[PDB]
Amino acid sequence: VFPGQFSDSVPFLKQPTNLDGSYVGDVGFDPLGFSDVFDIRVLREAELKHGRIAMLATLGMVVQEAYTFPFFDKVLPIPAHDVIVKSGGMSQILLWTSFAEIFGGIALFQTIQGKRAPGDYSFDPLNLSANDLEKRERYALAEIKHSRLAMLAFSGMVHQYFITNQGVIEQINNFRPINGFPDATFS
Amino acid sequence: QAIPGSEPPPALDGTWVGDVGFDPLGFSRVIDMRWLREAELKHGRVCMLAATGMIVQDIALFPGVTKTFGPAKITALHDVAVKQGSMQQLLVWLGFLEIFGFVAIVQMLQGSGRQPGDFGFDPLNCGANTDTLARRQLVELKNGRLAMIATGGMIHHFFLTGKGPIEFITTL
Amino acid sequence: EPQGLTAPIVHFGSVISLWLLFALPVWSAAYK
Ligand SMILES: CC1=C(C#C/C(C)=C/C=C/C(C)=C/C=C/C=C(C)/C=C/C=C(C)/C=C/C2=C(C)CCCC2(C)C)C(C)(C)C[C@H](O)C1
Numbered sequence: 003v004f005p006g007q008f009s010d011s012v013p014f015l016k017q018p019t020n021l022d023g024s025y026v027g028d029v030g031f032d033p034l035g036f037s038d039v040f041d042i043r044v045l046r047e048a049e050l051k052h053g054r055i056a057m058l059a060t061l062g063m064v065v066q067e068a069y070t071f072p073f074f075d076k077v078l079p080i081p082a083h084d085v086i087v088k089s090g091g092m093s094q095i096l097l098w099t100s101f102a103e104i105f106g107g108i109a110l111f112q113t114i115q116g117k118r119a120p121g122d123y124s125f126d127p128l129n130l131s132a133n134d135l136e137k138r139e140r141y142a143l144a145e146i147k148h149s150r151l152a153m154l155a156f157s158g159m160v161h162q163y164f165i166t167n168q169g170v171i172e173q174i175n176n177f178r179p180i181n182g183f184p185d186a187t188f189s
Numbered sequence: 190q191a192i193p194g195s196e197p198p199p200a201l202d203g204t205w206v207g208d209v210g211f212d213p214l215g216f217s218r219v220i221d222m223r224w225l226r227e228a229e230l231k232h233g234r235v236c237m238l239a240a241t242g243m244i245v246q247d248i249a250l251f252p253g254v255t256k257t258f259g260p261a262k263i264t265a266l267h268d269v270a271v272k273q274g275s276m277q278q279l280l281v282w283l284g285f286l287e288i289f290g291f292v293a294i295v296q297m298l299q300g301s302g303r304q305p306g307d308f309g310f311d312p313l314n315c316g317a318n319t320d321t322l323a324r325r326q327l328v329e330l331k332n333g334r335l336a337m338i339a340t341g342g343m344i345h346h347f348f349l350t351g352k353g354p355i356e357f358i359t360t361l
Numbered sequence: 362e363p364q365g366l367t368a369p370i371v372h373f374g375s376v377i378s379l380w381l382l383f384a385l386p387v388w389s390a391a392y393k
């Protein structure tokens with residue numbers, strides 16, 4: 003309300019020092035100043051890695067309840083974590099993702115040197131936005147928005163299962179309030 | 190000019206809303222003025238909402254809330270709602286908002302440019318023009334102080350009598 | 362049932378240890 007320069011997202015906080023706006027998805031939202039303590043490139047790579055993992059996590063949390071493979075067994079994903087820990091396949095997932103992150107770490111260390119864009123592994127086999135440059139930043143904005151939405155969504159689904167003990171598809175069709183609150187007294 | 194015998198602290202020299210020179214103990218001598226005014230507006234707004242909410246609660250309740258919370262109001266309502274999880278949700282989300290409030294206070298104290306109590310929350314462009322904004326600032330401050338005293342009064346009235354605001358004032 | 366290095370407990374412990382071992386230099390450099 004009072005005159006002064008502030009961030010586009012939060013109107014009572016100023017624009018952060020290291021959020022100039024060159025990176026996609028930047029609405030000037032850094033209240034605690036994480037970009038002032040650590041580099042924006044490392045933070046962007048961490049954000050993209052978390053967001054992509056969360057995208058695949060939300061897709062899995064939907065599909066595993068929607069359709070389970072003929073092998074393994076029909077079980078909810080959260081205890082399926084323990085089931086596949088005891089089965090041995092999750093250790094192999096860990097090994098292969100570690101093998102990918104071995105090269106990912108070298109990519110990150112070259113990102114600090116400023117030789118590659120943060121989160122840019124140059125993986126476009128379908129050339130969906132490789133030849134065209136105007137589509138590239140639009141797809142980057144879409145990817146980062148989907149990344150944040152997927153992180154929020156996976157956290158929501160997990161914490162809904164933790165108190166509801168129902169599947170995500172089960173909860174949107176058999177919606178029950180927690181703790182027996184429909185007919186609860188002195189809660 | 191509030192108290193003719195005494196004098197205001199040198200931090201109280203006008204150019205502030207509600208400055209009638211009333212600070213005999215000298216809080217502005219050791220505390221920054223921006224922090225003091227931000228805290229004054231925060232207490233005032235919290236007590237405004239609390240007093241209006243207490244009046245509404247003692248007048249009319251939500252559907253289905255009496256089935257769970259029973260005939261408990263004010264402090265018994267708090268004691269039941271902490272177990273219910275309503276006040277836990279309030280604490281979580283209001284502390285989440287107070288994170289941004291905290292960094293707003295920090296940027297104000299280090300010189301971003303914002304004024305104490307200014308969170309930019311002005312829907313419908315109400316009172317954003319001319320001297321109406323300053324009049325609304327004075328009204329907000331005075332009504333916040335009045336609501337602060339009234340909130341304390343209602344809390345202590347329920348402490349003494351065990352009755353709500355609208356029923357204590359009608360059953361003296 | 363597996364024990365020692367073949368157990369998955371040591372596997373996730375090892376990945377956490379590598380996470381900290383790589384958390385030192387990458388965040389030290391992001392700080393610098
Ligand atoms: C800011 C803003 C807005 C806004 C807004 C809002 C939400 C403004 C809200 C203002 C509020 C809630 C003011 C409350 C005042 C309460 C007082 C003075 C105390 C009452 C209690 C008393 C008198 C107790 C009396 C008592 C009783 C009963 C019995 C015991 C005795 C005693 C204790 C004395 C919008 C939405 C308009 C938009 C705008 O763009 C931005």
Ligand SMILES: CC1=C(C#C/C(C)=C/C=C/C(C)=C/C=C/C=C(C)/C=C/C=C(C)/C=C/C2=C(C)CCCC2(C)C)C(C)(C)C[C@H](O)C1
Nearest residue numbers: 191211263264265266267268337338339340341342344345
């Ligand atoms: C603890 C507890 C709870 C609680 C609680 C709560 C909310 C307790 C709150 C207590 C409060 C707010 C007390 C404040 C009273 C106001 C005073 C003393 C000042 C009045 C103004 C004056 C005298 C002005 C004087 C004046 C001045 C200076 C200027 C002009 C002259 C004059 C007018 C004389 C719960 C609800 C959580 C439940 C829990 O289980 C137990």
